[PDB]
Amino acid sequence: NLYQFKNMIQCTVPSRSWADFADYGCYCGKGGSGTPVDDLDRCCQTHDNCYNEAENISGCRPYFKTYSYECTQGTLTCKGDNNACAASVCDCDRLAAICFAGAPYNDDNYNIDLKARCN
């Protein structure tokens, strides 16, 4: 869940508050739809897709699902106890967080008009 995703972001990208990613480009935070403004938006886009596939697993709700994971000494790990759904969700978030840590951050792309630059 987004509390855990939050904590994931906070442990892979220390220097930057998680809020910085809650409203960026067309796919970070606010729904989406349209071409990702940039790499950091692409990370999120892939992340939105991951959630949609996960939604295919019945009784699987990407935002409220609580999975098992840990982050220590710079290592983000999805534990083995997770069922199919939790595992998927965990890995979605995990891949995203790692993606965030390697992508540039453009301030011009923070909180852009959604309605006019994304249908």
């Binding site: 987004l2 809650a22 970070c28 935070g29 999120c44």
Partner: peptide
């Protein structure tokens, strides 16, 4: 309160 991505 709410949602990142």
């Amino acid at each position: 309160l709410a949602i990142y991505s």
